[PDB]
Design a binder for this molecule. Structure first.
Ligand SMILES: Nc1nc2c(ncn2[C@@H]2O[C@H](COP(=O)(O)OP(=O)(O)OP(=O)(O)O)[C@@H](O)[C@H]2O)c(=O)[nH]1
Ligand SMILES: Nc1nc2c(ncn2[C@@H]2O[C@H](COP(=O)(O)OP(=O)(O)O)[C@@H](O)[C@H]2O)c(=O)[nH]1
Ligand SMILES: [Mg+2]
Ligand SMILES: [Mg+2]
Ligand SMILES: [Mg+2]
Ligand SMILES: [Mg+2]
Lengths: 5, 440, 428
């Protein structure tokens, strides 16, 4: 699971 | 900060080193004379590429590397080659007489004559580091230097640097391009000696790379230059997280955390995609979804093992180029559905992913198509143990008759050192079996 | 009981810490340079709680930024409000913690902890009357988890009569693929049961599910997850930041919320749930704020409150509304779902109403529940933990830093006790 502001 | 020193031992180590640093230069826009027009930080820098490259007043970007060989022919070609200006002469260290495919000569007879000089030059590089991360050691399993001297150096490095990380890129022997009958011997010896001195070792099976070059690139009889150029792309993928940085980038040490459940189980399986010719790549673009699928096709593995018959202990995906989180997440969802991929019961099943938006480049006159996006999967599977098994069997057949053992004894080794090394290998195969068993 | 000292440790800690200051600064009418430019005077009444004053009457956050790598803090300093923070209150190393609790708590972090406590001490002397500290951090990493709990243990030693508050981000495989996070979290929990008075259990499993299911974000980002945390943090501290009657300081909150010293792990909820893209043109009715704020969908902890019982509840309503109607709907839930509230704590639901609403909303409701259903969270981590520990997996990362298997067994044991303790009072 890829999650950057 | 977080500098990484590369050490290239022996012919394989050096020649692979050439391919790698050539490729690195092309990736960072560094000319063969070390100059880098992009870098405005003259004489210094804090950038991501500075972990592999130091800078000088002249504006010259110098590889944090050392090339060592007990015989000058191979390194001499570097000294006179296209990228001769890239290095400082003290970084290219040669002997006169090689180890004659003899581990004993590499570790003892010839190796002892040069080990201090090498360490002195390694030390001089370490002094340039604001915060050394560790070493990368490129070597062959089969060569006398690649096996014997590498073990000696790794042992010495454990002493002189304590527990700073030491990663291996080890060339596993293949009959199609084997140079010695005793490569099984050298392999088991170096593996045993280095095992407790290496934090993580990426095995490159030449037969696998030979196969991939023949199959995917339609190269009739692959040369070292062929294998190296493919190997370099893979090494580049693994070190991309160290040399570039973006929001979606995951440092190699983070992958390392997932990949090594026990100190001895530190041999990840590499699988790279897409390996495709320019002819096939024309008018055919490969999606994030497509390349991700290839990582689970054993034809694209770097070692000839069968993960299907084994169990998974970790899965990392090192993406580079045109890759977005959305597509990756959907891609793995597919594979979670379209494959089965069994994990051991004591590990979680998530895939640790990293992304570097910097796309893969290719060396001129290269065989590989220039693709928009690529991926390297690092997996910790019990199947890797197959590699040890094939090699341990070859070893067993010769040692049973003590074949060739006299060339080793004559240089100073003992039969005990052989049986000892072989017992460690038996324990390692046993270990790789233990982890696969279900819990109670 | 006046000044609060804020601390934020690690990547997660500094990100949510920054976002928290972004939000309340806007609510208190403080700009990035630190000058005041707001309408109402309610904004400056209890401004001294979280901010210090300087020459030119500039307002400086009472915040200490901690990390073992310069990454996030360099980004925060070049963030929106980056220049607001006291430059000297940036305390960072270079080695990093490598998502390792041991590195954060025993080796790499021990090498830096003393320097941080110097900044804590300097801020604590500027205080006319210190309440205590609020820490923001994740339990899944190394710095915030390991070094954070170390700072707590050390701070409790210098200020044992002060209140220790925490916003602790619980890990979830739905958000991170790092395998060792259950180790880090279990070790941290042990520290938190012993050395905090109040802990807001911000669960990344909840924040993700909220973002994906309710807010319909197919690829949730940290910014999306943090928008929820930021909203929660604003609401939970509203009773602290503006003039109020209920739970107006950390100790009073603790006395109302904590019936037993170890059971101080709160379940935060919020309504209306919002994304940075959501429009929110239609303000909700008071009944709607209430039905949602008690709805599991709005809980930030990923626990089903119907599986346990509420020991205590604090409810905070914001915006101009019928304070009459607030009481009726609040009394309605209690009387409707009376079975889910323990009978041996009469009137365990307390309510406050602040007039100033949060940024972008006219009507908002925040929830703070000490539910026994929180055990489901600790049960989740405990299982992820044992799955690995029964085979002693990945322990070499920790033993290499000097730890021993026994210290894991004790942390595992203590958190199993916590779960059982939460279960003891659920059947009372
Ligand atoms: N992939 C790849 N493998 C190589 C290359 N050069 C040598 N090898 C492999 O390395 C093994 C032999 O070891 P070498 O590295 O050539 O020997 P060495 O390290 O120079 O040690 P000595 O010559 O015995 O002192 C063979 O099995 C080769 O297949 C190379 O350039 N690329
Ligand atoms: N909500 C949220 N969680 C985060 C963020 N950064 C990291 N995390 C979580 O924190 C854990 C990793 O800890 P991290 O703060 O990165 O490590 P540290 O720097 O050593 O404290 C993982 O479980 C992440 O999901 C963030 O910005 N927001
Ligand atoms: Mg040679
Ligand atoms: Mg530079
Ligand atoms: Mg990180
Ligand atoms: Mg140090």
């Amino acid at each position: 699971x890829v999650x950057x502001x | 900060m977080r500098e990484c020193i590369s050490i290239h031992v022996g012919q394989a180590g050096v020649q692979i080193g050439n391919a790698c640093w050539e490729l690195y230069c092309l990736e960072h826009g560094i000319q063969p004379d070390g100059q880098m027009p992009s870098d405005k930080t003259i004489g210094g820098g804090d950038d991501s590429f500075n972990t592999f490259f130091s800078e000088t007043g002249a504006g010259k970007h110098v590889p944090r590397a050392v090339f060592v060989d007990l015989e000058p022919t191979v390194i001499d070609e570097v000294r006179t080659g296209t990228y001769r200006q890239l290095f400082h002469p003290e970084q290219l260290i040669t002997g006169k007489e090689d180890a004659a495919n003899n581990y004993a000569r590499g570790h003892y007879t010839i190796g002892k004559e040069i080990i201090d000089l090498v360490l002195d030059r390694i030390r001089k590089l370490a002094d340039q580091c604001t915060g050394l991360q560790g070493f990368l050691v490129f070597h062959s399993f089969g060569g006398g230097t690649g096996s014997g001297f590498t073990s000696l150096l790794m042992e010495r490095l454990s002493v002189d640097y304590g527990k700073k990380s030491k990663l291996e890129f080890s060339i596993y022997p293949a009959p199609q391009v084997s140079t010695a009958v005793v490569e099984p011997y050298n392999s088991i010896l170096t593996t045993h000696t280095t095992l407790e001195h290496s934090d993580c070792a990426f095995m490159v099976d030449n037969e696998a790379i030979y196969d991939i070059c023949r199959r995917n690139l339609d190269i009739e009889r692959p040369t070292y230059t062929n294998l190296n150029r493919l190997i370099s792309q893979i090494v580049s993928s693994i070190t991309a997280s160290l040399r570039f940085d973006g929001a979606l980038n995951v440092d190699l040490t983070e992958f390392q955390t997932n990949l090594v459940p026990y100190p001895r189980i530190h041999f990840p399986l590499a699988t790279y995609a897409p390996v495709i010719s320019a002819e096939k790549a024309y008018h055919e673009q490969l999606s994030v979804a497509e390349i991700t699928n290839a990582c689970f096709e054993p034809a694209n593995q770097m070692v000839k093992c069968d993960p299907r018959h084994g169990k998974y202990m970790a899965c990392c995906l090192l993406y580079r180029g045109d890759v977005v989180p959305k597509d990756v997440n959907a891609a793995i969802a597919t594979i979670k559905t379209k494959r089965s991929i069994q994990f051991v019961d004591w590990c979680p099943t998530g895939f640790k992913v990293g992304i570097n938006y910097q796309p893969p480049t290719v060396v001129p006159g290269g065989d590989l198509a220039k693709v928009q996006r690529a991926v390297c999967m690092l997996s910790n599977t019990t199947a890797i143990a197959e590699a040890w098994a094939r090699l341990d069997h070859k070893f067993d057949l010769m040692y049973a008759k003590r074949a060739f053992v006299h060339w080793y004894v004559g240089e100073g080794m003992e039969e005990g050192e052989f049986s000892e090394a072989r017992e460690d290998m038996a324990a390692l195969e046993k270990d790789y079996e233990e982890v696969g068993v279900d819990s109670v | 009981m006046r000044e609060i000292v804020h601390i934020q440790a690690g990547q997660c800690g500094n990100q949510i810490g920054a976002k928290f200051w972004e939000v309340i600064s806007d609510e208190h009418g403080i700009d990035p340079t630190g000058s005041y430019h707001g309408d109402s005077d309610l904004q400056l009444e209890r401004i001294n709680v979280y901010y210090n004053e300087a020459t030119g009457n500039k307002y400086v956050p009472r915040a200490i930024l901690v990390d073992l790598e310069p990454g996030t803090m360099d980004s925060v300093r070049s963030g929106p409000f980056g220049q607001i923070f006291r430059p000297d209150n940036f305390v960072f190393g270079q080695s990093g913690a490598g998502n390792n609790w041991a590195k954060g708590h025993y080796t790499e972090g021990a090498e830096l902890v003393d320097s941080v406590l110097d900044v804590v001490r300097k801020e604590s002397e500027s205080c006319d009357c210190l309440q205590g500290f609020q820490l923001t951090h994740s339990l899944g990493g190394g710095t915030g988890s390991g070094m954070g709990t170390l700072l707590i243990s050390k701070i409790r030693e210098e200020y044992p009569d002060r209140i220790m508050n925490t916003f602790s981000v619980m890990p979830s495989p739905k958000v991170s693929d790092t395998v060792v996070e259950p180790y880090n979290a279990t070790l941290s929990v042990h520290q938190l049961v012993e050395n905090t008075d109040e802990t807001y259990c911000i669960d990344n499993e909840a924040l993700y599910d909220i973002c994906f299911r309710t807010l319909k974000l197919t690829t949730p980002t940290y910014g999306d997850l943090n928008h929820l945390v930021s909203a929660t943090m604003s609401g939970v501290t509203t009773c602290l930041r503006f003039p109020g009657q209920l739970n107006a300081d950390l100790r009073k909150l603790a006395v109302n919320m904590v019936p037993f010293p170890r059971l101080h792990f709160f379940m935060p909820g919020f309504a209306p749930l919002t994304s940075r893209g959501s429009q929110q043109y239609r303000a909700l009715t008071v009944p709607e704020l209430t039905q949602q704020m008690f709805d599991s969908k709005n809980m930030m902890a990923a626990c089903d409150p119907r599986h346990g019982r509420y020991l205590t509840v604090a409810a905070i309503f914001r915006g101009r509304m019928s304070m009459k109607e607030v009481d009726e709907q609040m009394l309605n839930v209690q009387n409707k779902n009376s079975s889910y509230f323990v009978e041996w704590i009469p009137n365990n639901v307390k309510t406050a109403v602040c007039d100033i609403p949060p940024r972008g909303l006219k009507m908002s409701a925040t929830f703070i529940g000490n539910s026994t259903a929180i055990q489901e969270l600790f049960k989740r981590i405990s299982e992820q933990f044992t799955a690995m520990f029964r085979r002693k997996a990945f322990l070499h990362w920790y033993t290499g830093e000097g730890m021993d298997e026994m210290e894991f067994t004790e942390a595992e044991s203590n958190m199993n006790d916590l779960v059982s303790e939460y279960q003891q009072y659920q059947d009372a």
